[PDB]
């Protein structure tokens, strides 16, 4: 087992500089503080010599504020000087109440440190492919090259020849400053159509369904998970993936701890401990933890067949509407009352690829969705009694006929699941029908991924459906590719084909570059353009590490992430915080928003020198010298309630921030919105919500049914608790990599026995899309025929076996994947030290 052998830690002194810090990582947005103080000083164990006012000579008690793990401690540069830093979770933050997850609590140890040699992989200098390898250089040199190639291709081929891949998210590698910067470059200065997002290969929304219906996806507050009678948890593994929401808000509900709170806010009605329905094909540690906390009678795990959620929700909708277990006045008052006729191709297809579902009234939607318990039991593989029970836990009145309050929470099990638009809609139907939006203990919400931090100019030019970028790239289209803060090599769909083609096309430009003179820049630029014209691709990566896609790139631009800069974002409750800079960017690395600005300045200069003065002038408005300039040009001027928010005011509010949108500022407080839709006025022209007539139509995405019928196993995929995303930071973190050197593929012990495998064996997963590797992990809770592989992992990319299949709006259907499995090697020696024991807590 990995052990740091760090016997003691420097003590935070009493005069240490305090900084407010939102977690770099997940949507929950747990509050932390970073405390820094000069190298060559320290606190003492006497109360007035440390920050805690506590005697550190004696053993602190459980949940102590006066302790931190070694992963919370580092040394970093700050204004050019080495300082001690501790990054420690805030007890006073209502999101987390001092919880720090396994990811967040390692922000310090995954920071860049020369003095203690952490994250020495971090990018420090611009790199350019020249003289036969990547070579460091100046910013002026590298941007120049990028601008000139980009400018020439775009002048000769139009802006369609510029392909962009970029984060649209919040937190580290995202945020309002950084989404504004990149957005402004590509959508204000330019009209880039062939742009895709970090997690999906087109410029779309994850949840067009709920938005079209008028219900924006983050409509509740985290307190609603404490107040609900029933939590409906769809396609979430929240203990692993939205950890501290689960622990600090859901658990008190299930345990009975929030009964006093329920009673005070909602007398006039009966309350019991929270019950929970979990819709997930896989029995997860979330399921186990729910059972251990609430008892098994209070947990309904619907272990559905992969991709059958829509059938289940349509049955639930049918049964609840027939019983009349609905909020009649919410429907009359707040939903669309005049139905409208089905489009001609229904139920198989919508009016067009742009509208996969039919929006209409409650009663039209019920008749459209109508599915009996017996049909949904066939499709979902659930028992009829399980479906009836869940309709009861969602819809049945409580004693005295009072409305059952239900928080409906969904994430990637649904969004990357089958028929995203219709499944999304059919779940929103359940919430609208039961009046569970805009009310305490309600919500139909994304549980979320990254934090949120989106402000950009109009994307109207993009279209709906937008262009499927990976397919343009695979098919030889496009000339120049700017990649910001994502790594398709590890995380796109159909990733094996993507890599083969991306290498080949970038190699053409590599070979031309190696053979041409660099010091003569015009000749290098022309040699690149000639290669692009023959089918090559010139590629530029803006990142904080050497990425996998980066190995194909021609120019790499070093970025500064959260904490090295100021950053704003909101959590899954709309809670906007400012993370206050506490350290310097490594070497010459620079905030993304300022990278975009310097790039815009360079485009202007270059286009001017080419004599295209008109095009050059589109790139003005980028005079920003610090990230706050981007905040003010973007968020402050464009978000609803943006006028009320500044860095100074945000900082004053601390880690609790406020909930967006801001409604005003009085008495040094930004006033916010606790829940959305409290007045029953939805996000449509007429203020009414729509229901969705959304009939089940099987596996919707191309090739999926053929992939299921022709391979042995389900290759379910997703997150591990210990791993953050594509392990970009984690690959230089021994604690994480000592645990999983290879990605795990969870397999039922009997399935393993049948296939001739033993724990730790390295196996090839393969199908029609490609092939990859993973380490067999015996998982007694796994159903026969169903495996789960860790996604995004550098030592075994799951995406290689995901097909190209998307829904009509180009949403990638990663969860419905099937494959074969065969052995590559006996368990390697580098895996002999691992535990292969169950991940479930035992009582």
């Amino acid at each position: 087992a990995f052990k740091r052998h760090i016997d003691r830690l420097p003590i935070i002194p009493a005069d240490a500089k305090k900084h407010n810090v939102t977690c770099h990582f997940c949507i929950v947005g747990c509050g932390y503080h970073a405390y820094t103080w000069p190298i060559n000083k320290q606190g003492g164990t006497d109360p007035q010599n440390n920050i805690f006012g506590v005697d550190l000579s004696e053993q602190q008690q459980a949940e102590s504020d006066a302790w931190y793990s070694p992963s919370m401690y580092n040394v970093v540069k700050q204004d050019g000087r080495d300082v001690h830093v501790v990054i420690k979770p805030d007890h006073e933050c209502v999101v987390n109440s001092g919880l720090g997850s396994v990811r967040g609590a390692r922000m310090a140890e995954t920071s860049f440190s020369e003095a203690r040699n952490t994250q020495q992989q971090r990018l420090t200098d611009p790199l350019v492919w020249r003289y036969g390898q990547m070579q460091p250089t100046s910013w002026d040199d590298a941007l120049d090259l990028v601008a000139r190639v980009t400018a020439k291709i775009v002048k000769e081929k139009g802006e369609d020849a510029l392909i962009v891949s970029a984060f649209d998210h919040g937190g580290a590698g995202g945020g309002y400053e950084n989404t504004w910067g990149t957005g402004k470059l590509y959508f204000e200065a330019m009209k880039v159509k062939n742009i895709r997002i970090h997690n999906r290969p087109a410029y779309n929304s994850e949840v067009h369904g709920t938005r079209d219906m008028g219900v924006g996806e983050l409509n509740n507050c985290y307190e609603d998970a404490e107040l609900a009678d029933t939590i409906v948890a769809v396609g979430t593994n929240a203990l692993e993936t939205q950890t501290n929401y689960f622990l600090n808000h859901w658990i008190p509900n299930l345990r009975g701890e929030s009964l006093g709170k329920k009673k005070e806010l909602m007398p006039e009605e009966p309350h019991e401990a929270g019950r929970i329905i979990i819709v997930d094909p896989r029995r997860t540690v979330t399921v186990n933890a729910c059972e251990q906390t609430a008892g098994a009678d209070n947990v309904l795990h619907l272990a559905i067949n992969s991709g059958t959620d829509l059938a289940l929700f349509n049955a639930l909708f049918t049964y609840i509407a027939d019983k009349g277990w609905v909020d009649r006045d919410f429907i009359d008052k707040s939903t669309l009352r005049e139905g409208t006729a089905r489009p001609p191709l229904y139920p198989a297809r919508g009016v067009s690829e742009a509208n996969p579902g039919h929006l209409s009234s409650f009663e039209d939607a019920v008749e459209g969705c109508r599915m009996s318990i017996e049909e949904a039991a066939e499709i979902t593989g659930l028992d009829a009694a399980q479906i009836i029970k869940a309709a009861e836990w969602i819809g049945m009145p409580k004693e005295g006929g009072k409305r059952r309050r239900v928080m409906f929470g969904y994430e990637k099990g649904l969004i990357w699941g089958n028929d995203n638009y219709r499944t999304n809609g059919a779940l929103v139907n359940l919430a609208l029908a039961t009046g569970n939006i805009g009310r305490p203990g309600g919500g139909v919400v994304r549980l979320g991924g990254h934090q949120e931090g989106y402000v950009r100019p109009s994307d109207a030019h993009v279209g709906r459906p937008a262009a499927y970028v990976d397919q343009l790239l695979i098919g030889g289209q496009g000339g120049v590719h700017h990649i910001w803060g994502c790594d398709h090599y590890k995380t796109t769909l159909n990733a094996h084909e993507f890599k083969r083609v991306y290498k080949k096309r970038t190699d053409m430009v590599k070979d031309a570059m190696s053979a041409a003179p660099y010091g003569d820049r015009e000749a290098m630029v022309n040699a690149i353009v000639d290669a692009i014209n023959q089918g090559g691709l010139f590629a530029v990566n803006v990142d904080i590490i050497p990425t996998k896609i980066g190995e194909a790139c021609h120019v790499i631009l070093p970025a500064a992430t959260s904490g090295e800069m100021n950053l704003t974002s909101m959590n899954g409750e709309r809670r906007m915080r400012l993370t206050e800079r506490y350290m310097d960017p490594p070497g010459q690395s620079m905030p993304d928003c300022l990278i975009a600005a310097r790039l815009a300045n360079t485009m202007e200069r270059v286009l001017t020198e080419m004599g295209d003065v008109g095009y050059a002038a589109q790139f003005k408005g980028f005079d920003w010298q610090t990230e706050e300039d981007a905040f003010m040009d973007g968020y402050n001027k464009n978000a609803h309630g943006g006028e009320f928010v500044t860095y100074e005011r945000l900082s004053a509010m601390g880690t609790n921030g406020f909930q967006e949108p801001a409604t005003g500022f009085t008495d040094g407080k930004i006033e916010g919105t606790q829940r959305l839709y409290t007045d029953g006025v939805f996000s449509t022209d007429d203020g009414k919500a729509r229901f969705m007539d959304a009939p089940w139509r099987g596996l919707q995405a191309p090739g999926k049914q053929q992939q299921k019928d022709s391979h042995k196993y389900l290759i379910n995929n997703g997150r591990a608790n210990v791993v953050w995303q594509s392990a970009y930071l984690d690959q230089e973190n021994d604690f994480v990599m000592d645990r999983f050197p290879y990605p795990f593929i969870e397999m039922n012990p009997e399935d393993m026995a049948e296939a001739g495998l033993k724990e730790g064996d390295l196996v090839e997963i393969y199908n029609d899309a490609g092939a990859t590797q993973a380490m067999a992990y015996p998982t007694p809770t796994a159903r026969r025929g169903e495996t789960f592989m860790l996604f995004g992992f550098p030592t075994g990319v799951q995406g290689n076996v995901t097909s190209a299949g998307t829904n009509e709006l180009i949403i990638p259907n990663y969860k419905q994947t099937w494959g074969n499995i065969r052995k590559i090697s006996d368990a390697p020696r580098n895996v002999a030290h691992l535990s292969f024991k169950s991940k479930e807590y035992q009582s």
Binding site: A1, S835, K837
Partner: protein, 132 residues
């Protein structure tokens, strides 16, 4: 003093321990709960004739809840937020919220069966120095 000065403390005798049954101990002082445990097989950090006696803190490095031991599984389990540690593999966190594998004792067996502890390989919950 550049490193922590760990005392070498007698904890028990090889004869006091029964197979697969933890015995409560404390190290490096009375306020730091732990166990010795004889596991039945040669393991990482294990001492004695069979290389199977290990010692661990039993205070969760996440937030301090005392860990229970499941005998059927040979794991330590946290009632706080569901962490599991494997003392058959150096205390590796099998699944959990701590950023540390379970602090484990550097043990020595004396010629007379006595069991000393003279080290711990991670930071014990609730102290910024393992020796206070």
């Amino acid at each position: 003093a550049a490193g922590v000065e760990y005392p070498a403390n007698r904890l028990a005798n090889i004869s006091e321990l029964t197979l697969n049954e933890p015995l409560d101990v404390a190290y490096p002082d009375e306020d730091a709960a732990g166990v010795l445990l004889k596991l039945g097989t040669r393991v990482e950090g294990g001492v004695g004739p069979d290389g199977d006696i290990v010692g661990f803190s039993t205070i969760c490095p996440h937030k301090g809840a005392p860990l229970s031991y499941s005998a059927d599984n040979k794991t330590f389990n946290c009632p706080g937020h569901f962490s599991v540690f494997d003392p058959e593999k150096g205390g590796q966190q099998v699944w959990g919220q701590a950023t540390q594998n379970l602090p484990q004792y550097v043990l020595r067996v004396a010629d007379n069966g006595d069991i000393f502890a003279e080290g711990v390989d991670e930071l014990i919950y609730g102290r910024l120095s393992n020796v206070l």
